[PDB]
């Protein structure tokens, strides 16, 4: 006897179409230079993309990566971790991964364009309220501890990014970065238990409201992103 | 006096865990026909049933080929009908298959039965359901198939003891002592039993 | 019989008009939490379906319901909702697949529903599908119905139009199927078809033993099928009318070819069939001679005699339709209580 | 020692040094060891012959009847020597062993006769 085939079809109309998304490492930095640099690096990373897929993701997503290592069992290295940040631009761009195993918190900075790495895989795709999850260091280990054998949570092909709106408990005050300040504007943590009302009142004194209203510091990216899309589509057609 | 709590805690936890995730009836009844060893046990089967397990199938595998698993349909105990020429069957009343089974070839079902045309008025539990000795009789050849129609001396020493006792008592009672045997309903081995009385892993 | 075939009351009676996607998502939730679910959900899904992929979803969810905590309910009205949804959208491959692996899906149509299905098969003029389906009905063991005449017509036509010399499975299927339609004790056609089925079963036994006779086929274990056929012939000669066909020649052929030159189920005292062949053949010749001495036209084609049956067929189809409307009425009666039952949960909530 | 379930059983306890067994019929539980503790000592048995050549054995009929009425199973040798005594029915395996011995002796006599 052959097994039946699973099939599922749920067709709410104004949910299915998600249109566009671009990676934050294509965009250049505010610094000045001649954009031919950018465009040649872009076509280079795209001629690499034709080989390697980089299944898109965000901070707070879980990635499993297999890489070709010279000195290891099977000459390969397989590592799963939570994405902390995607830092840098051009080819040297990288993404951080972290996980607690054997009670020890190990984290890597993977180059997403180095030929040493063989394949990347998105086990779970989600987004956190905070731009960067570096406070997961001082956070409890039970939040970062993830299973290595956990299989990919299959995600819909054309749907909106799921966002887990949650909060996180943390280790006591002796921290390294002073996350309580408003310089970072993070919300995953829970002041109500991580500190006192008087303490947050004393800390929110460094608040600089004027800068977020300032306008010469923010960088417009609309037409740059449009030209980047145009060049990507041209390279794909070619 | 000092009590102890972790023992009762582990007892309750083990009870809940086993009653939750006990091995499925189908999972533990499955058999590989070329090696004749039940999985989850690694035990071999009896030589008397080797061939029957190789050839014949199970009750639920028989009942899966007809609607409602054949309520009231003729199923007979192959062992009973090979051991006795008289007809014996099962008036199956209630049925429940195991959802985890792929072919729905395992479960629990029972009703009224009859041994050599001796029917009782009780819908009780079957015995030995998982065996490969199940034979289904069609709806035709039904009534033709289901058609069906003192004392002993005591031991010598015991009778001598009673003789001496009543002679000392004074009564003659020349009649040899006896007991009733028609009351004694010696039942054959094959008379069924209570499934619930026997346990389960 | 277009009036007997078509019935739009079914499709215009008690439609639910719910979202197939919502019903599918709810069923997926219930079955991933592996809790039991009523047949109302599946019925609403089925009678809401109007598409091919939707009927495929229904097939998958029917498999999943068979493998769900509840399997015995087996509501015939839901079965017929599914059957109509499939046959009106003309998925005969899917219908046949489900019907053959009933153990995989568990569909069990009743008399009138199956007669409608086989009449649609007639209208489309296919034989292999109808043959497999009548073998699966032989498996069903449900024949005391007005569809008995349809089964008889089908088998009487296909055993003649077969043109297949050697096939043990197929021949055993034919032999075991030719008994059930004739069990209504009608006439020469009936009991002579019973005779030919006895002959085929005895042949299958003598050529591949008694094991397959009963193993995956509901049959009786008495090996004397030839003796039973001889008994039938002798009691018929003793007793009405006996319209006969030349399948007695096929019986003679089988007998002569068997007379032509491990577990032992046979009993020691009782003789073996291999050793009974001689007296089987002698008594068979004797009964042949007795029958020809006593009806013996052997020209009336049996499949043509089923056209004479069409009159009482068209008479009994009326009672069949009446029973079908009674079934519809009692379905509509007992089903409405189940909807208030579903509302009772929200009332308590 | 409170044994779970179990049931009383009259059986044999062994005594005496090696190569000199002395059996004692005694009531006890099913789960106790061979020479374990008991409840009431009932009788004795010598599988060896005395100076007269006969073998010794004693039964406590009233107490045994009381224990059986209270409910206690017996072992195969128990019922065997009881049936040999006569207070109990004779043993079917005893009958079969006797018949097999007689068949073997008849076979041996036939073999000797056909040899000579
Ligand atoms: Mg530091
Ligand atoms: Zn001593």
Curated annotation (Swiss-Prot), chain A:
Full protein segment contained here: 55 to 292 of 292
GO molecular function, one term: structural constituent of ribosome
Keyword hit for Lipoprotein: no
Compartments (UniProt record): Mitochondrion
Record-level GO BP terms: mitochondrial translation
Family: Belongs to the bacterial ribosomal protein bL19 family.
Official protein name in the record: Large ribosomal subunit protein bL19m
Modified residues (Phosphoserine): 23
GO cellular component: mitochondrial inner membrane; mitochondrial large ribosomal subunit; mitochondrion; nucleus
Gene: MRPL19
UniProt keyword annotations, A-Z: Mitochondrion, Phosphoprotein, Ribonucleoprotein, Ribosomal protein, Transit peptide
Tagged with keyword Mitochondrion: yes
Subunit relationships: Component of the mitochondrial large ribosomal subunit (mt-LSU). Mature mammalian 55S mitochondrial ribosomes consist of a small (28S) and a large (39S) subunit. The 28S small subunit contains a 12S ribosomal RNA (12S mt-rRNA) and 30 different proteins. The 39S large subunit contains a 16S rRNA (16S mt-rRNA), a copy of mitochondrial valine transfer RNA (mt-tRNA(Val)), which plays an integral structural role, and 52 different proteins.
Swiss-Prot record, chain B:
Illness: Combined oxidative phosphorylation deficiency 32: An autosomal recessive disorder due to deficiency of mitochondrial respiratory chain complexes, I, III and IV, and characterized by delayed psychomotor development and neurodevelopmental regression. Additional variable symptoms include poor or absent speech, inability to walk, and abnormal movements.
Sorted UniProt keywords: Disease variant, Mitochondrion, Primary mitochondrial disease, Ribonucleoprotein, Ribosomal protein
Primary location: mitochondrion
GO cellular component terms listed in the entry, alphabetical order: mitochondrial inner membrane; mitochondrial small ribosomal subunit; mitochondrion
Originating species: Homo sapiens
Compositional bias of kind Basic and acidic residues: 184-200
Family of the protein in this entry: Belongs to the mitochondrion-specific ribosomal protein mS34 family.
Role this protein plays: Required for mitochondrial translation, plays a role in maintaining the stability of the small ribosomal subunit and the 12S rRNA that are required for mitoribosome formation.
Subunit structure: Component of the mitochondrial small ribosomal subunit (mt-SSU). Mature mammalian 55S mitochondrial ribosomes consist of a small (28S) and a large (39S) subunit. The 28S small subunit contains a 12S ribosomal RNA (12S mt-rRNA) and 30 different proteins. The 39S large subunit contains a 16S rRNA (16S mt-rRNA), a copy of mitochondrial valine transfer RNA (mt-tRNA(Val)), which plays an integral structural role, and 52 different proteins.
Hydrolase found in the keyword field: no
Entry keyword annotation includes Mitochondrion: yes
From Swiss-Prot, chain C:
GO annotation, biological process: cell population proliferation; mitochondrial translation; regulation of translation
Keywords: Coiled coil, Cytoplasm, Mitochondrion, Repeat, Ribonucleoprotein, Ribosomal protein, RNA-binding, rRNA-binding, Transit peptide, Translation regulation, tRNA-binding
Pfam family, any one: MRP-S27
Coiled-coil regions listed in the entry: 317-349
Coarse class of the protein's main subcellular location: cytoplasm
GO MF term list: rRNA binding; tRNA binding
Each PPR repeat, start to end: 75-109, 110-145
Any one Gene Ontology cellular component term annotated for this protein: mitochondrial small ribosomal subunit
Domain of life: Eukaryota
Transmembrane segments: none
Record localization: Cytoplasm; Mitochondrion
Keyword RNA-binding on entry: yes
InterPro entries: mS27/PTCD2, Pentatricopeptide_rpt, Ribosomal_mS27, TPR-like_helical_dom_sf
This protein's record includes keyword Secreted: no
Tissue-specific expression: Overexpressed in hepatocellular carcinoma tissues compared with adjacent non-tumoral liver tissues (at protein level). Ubiquitous.
Similarity annotation: Belongs to the mitochondrion-specific ribosomal protein mS27 family.
PANTHER family noted in UniProt: MITOCHONDRIAL 28S RIBOSOMAL PROTEIN S27, SMALL RIBOSOMAL SUBUNIT PROTEIN MS27
Role this protein plays: RNA-binding component of the mitochondrial small ribosomal subunit (mt-SSU) that plays a role in mitochondrial protein synthesis. Stimulates mitochondrial mRNA translation of subunit components of the mitochondrial electron transport chain. Binds to the mitochondrial 12S rRNA (12S mt-rRNA) and tRNA(Glu). Involved also in positive regulation of cell proliferation and tumor cell growth.
Protein name (database record): Small ribosomal subunit protein mS27
Protein species of origin: Homo sapiens (Human)
From Swiss-Prot, chain D:
Highest rank taxon of the organism: Eukaryota
Transit pept. (range): 1-25
Molecular-function annotations in GO: structural constituent of ribosome
Keywords: Mitochondrion, Phosphoprotein, Primary mitochondrial disease, Ribonucleoprotein, Ribosomal protein, Transit peptide
GO CC list: cytosol; mitochondrial inner membrane; mitochondrial small ribosomal subunit; mitochondrion
Main location: mitochondrion
GO biological processes: mitochondrial translation; translation
Compartments (UniProt record): Mitochondrion
Family, as annotated: Belongs to the bacterial ribosomal protein bS16 family.
Disease entry from the Swiss-Prot or TrEMBL record: Combined oxidative phosphorylation deficiency 2: A mitochondrial disease resulting in fatal neonatal metabolic acidosis with agenesis of the corpus callosum.
Record text on subunit structure and interactions: Component of the mitochondrial small ribosomal subunit (mt-SSU). Mature mammalian 55S mitochondrial ribosomes consist of a small (28S) and a large (39S) subunit. The 28S small subunit contains a 12S ribosomal RNA (12S mt-rRNA) and 30 different proteins. The 39S large subunit contains a 16S rRNA (16S mt-rRNA), a copy of mitochondrial valine transfer RNA (mt-tRNA(Val)), which plays an integral structural role, and 52 different proteins. bS16m has a zinc binding site.
UniProt protein name: Small ribosomal subunit protein bS16m
Source species: Homo sapiens (Human)
Organism classification: Eukaryota, Metazoa, Chordata, Craniata, Vertebrata
Range within the parent protein: 10 to 125 of 137
């Amino acid at each position: 006897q052959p097994p039946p085939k699973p099939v599922i079809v749920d067709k709410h109309r104004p949910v299915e179409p998600e249109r566009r998304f671009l990676s934050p490492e294509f965009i250049p930095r505010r610094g000045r230079t001649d954009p031919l640099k950018f465009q040649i690096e872009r076509k280079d990373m795209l001629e690499r993309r034709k080989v390697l897929h980089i299944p898109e993701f965000y901070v707070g997503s879980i990635l499993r990566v297999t890489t070709a290592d010279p000195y290891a069992s099977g000459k390969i290295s397989q590592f799963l971790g939570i994405c902390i940040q995607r830092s840098g631009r051009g080819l040297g761009a990288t993404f951080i991964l972290r996980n607690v195993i054997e009670g020890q918190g190990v984290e890597i900075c993977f180059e997403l364009y180095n030929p040493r790495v063989q394949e990347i895989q998105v086990v779970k795709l989600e987004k956190r309220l905070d731009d960067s999850l570096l406070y997961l260091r001082d956070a409890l280990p039970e939040y970062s501890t993830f299973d290595v054998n956990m299989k990919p949570v299959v995600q819909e092909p054309n749907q909106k990014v799921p966002v887990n709106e949650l909060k996180v408990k943390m280790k006591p005050k002796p921290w390294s970065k002073r996350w309580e300040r408003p310089n970072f504007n993070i919300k995953g943590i829970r002041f109500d238990l991580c500190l006192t009302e008087q303490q947050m009142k004393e800390a929110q004194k460094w608040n600089q409201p004027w800068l977020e209203f300032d306008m010469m510091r923010e960088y417009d990216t609309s037409k740059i992103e449009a030209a980047i899309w145009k060049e990507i589509e041209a390279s794909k057609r070619s | 006096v000092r009590p102890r709590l972790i023992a009762e805690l582990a007892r309750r936890v083990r009870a809940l865990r086993e009653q939750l995730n006990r091995p499925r009836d189908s999972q533990l009844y499955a058999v590989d026909y070329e090696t004749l060893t039940r999985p989850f046990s690694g035990r071999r089967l009896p030589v008397r049933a080797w061939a029957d397990v190789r050839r014949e199938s199970r009750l639920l595998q028989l009942l899966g080929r007809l609607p409602l698993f054949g309520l009231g349909r003729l199923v007979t105990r192959k062992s009973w009908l090979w051991q006795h020429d008289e007809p014996c069957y099962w008036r199956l009343t209630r049925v429940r298959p195991d959802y985890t089974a792929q072919n729905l070839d395992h479960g629990k079902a029972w009703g009224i039965l009859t041994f050599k045309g001796k029917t009782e008025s009780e819908a009780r539990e079957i015995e030995h359901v998982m065996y490969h000795d199940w034979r289904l009789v069609p709806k035709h050849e039904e009534e033709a198939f289901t058609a069906f129609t003192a004392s002993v001396p005591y031991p010598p020493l015991l009778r001598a003891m009673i003789i001496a006792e009543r002679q000392k008592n004074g009564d003659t009672s020349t009649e040899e002592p006896m007991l009733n045997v028609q009351r004694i309903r010696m039942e054959p081995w094959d008379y069924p039993a209570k499934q619930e009385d026997k346990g389960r892993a | 019989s277009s009036a007997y075939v078509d019935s739009h009351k079914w499709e215009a009676r008690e439609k639910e008009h719910y979202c197939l996607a919502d019903l599918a998502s709810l069923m997926d939730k219930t079955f991933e939490r592996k809790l039991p679910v009523s047949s109302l959900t599946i019925s609403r899904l089925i009678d809401n379906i109007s598409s091919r992929e939707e009927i495929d979803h229904a097939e998958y969810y029917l498999y999943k319901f068979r493998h769900s905590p509840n399997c015995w309910y087996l509501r015939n009205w839901t079965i017929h909702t599914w059957i109509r949804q499939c046959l009106k959208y003309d998925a005969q491959d899917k219908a046949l697949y489900t019907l053959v692996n009933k153990v995989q899906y568990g569909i069990f149509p009743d008399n009138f529903t199956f007669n409608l299905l086989m009449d649609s098969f007639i209208k489309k003029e296919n034989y292999k599908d109808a043959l497999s389906v009548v073998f699966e009905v032989m498996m069903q063991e449900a024949f005391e119905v007005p569809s008995t005449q349809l089964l008889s017509l089908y088998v009487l036509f296909h055993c003649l139009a077969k043109k297949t010399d050697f096939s043990w499975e197929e021949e055993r299927n034919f032999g075991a199927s030719l008994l059930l339609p004739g069990l209504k004790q009608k006439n020469s056609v009936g009991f002579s078809s019973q005779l030919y089925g006895y002959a085929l079963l005895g042949k299958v036994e003598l050529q591949q033993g008694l094991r397959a006779v009963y193993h995956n086929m509901p049959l009786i274990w008495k090996p004397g099928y030839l003796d039973r056929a001889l008994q039938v012939m002798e009691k018929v000669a003793a007793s009405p009318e006996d319209i006969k066909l030349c399948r007695e020649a096929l019986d003679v052929l089988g007998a002569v070819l068997k007379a032509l030159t491990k577990l032992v189920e046979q009993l020691d005292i009782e003789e073996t069939e291999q050793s009974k062949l001689p007296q089987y053949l002698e008594r068979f010749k004797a009964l042949h001679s007795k029958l020809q001495a006593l009806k013996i036209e052997s020209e009336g084609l049996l499949s043509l005699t089923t056209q004479l049956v069409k009159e009482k067929l068209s008479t009994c189809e009326a009672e069949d339709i009446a029973t079908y409307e009674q079934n519809l009425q009692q379905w509509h009666l007992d089903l409405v209580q189940l909807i208030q039952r579903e509302q009772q949960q929200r009332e308590q909530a | 020692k409170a044994y779970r379930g179990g049931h009383l059983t009259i059986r044999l306890a062994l005594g005496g040094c090696t190569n000199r067994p002395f059996y004692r019929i005694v009531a006890a539980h099913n789960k106790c060891p061979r020479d374990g503790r008991f409840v009431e000592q009932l009788g004795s048995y010598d599988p060896l012959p005395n100076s007269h050549g006969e073998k010794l054995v004693a039964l406590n009929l009233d107490r045994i009847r009381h224990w059986i009425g209270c409910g206690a199973h017996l072992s195969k040798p128990m019922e065997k020597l009881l049936g040999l005594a006569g207070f109990f029915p004779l043993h079917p395996m005893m009958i079969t062993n006797a018949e097999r011995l007689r068949r073997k002796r008849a076979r041996e006599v036939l073999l000797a006769s056909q040899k000579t």
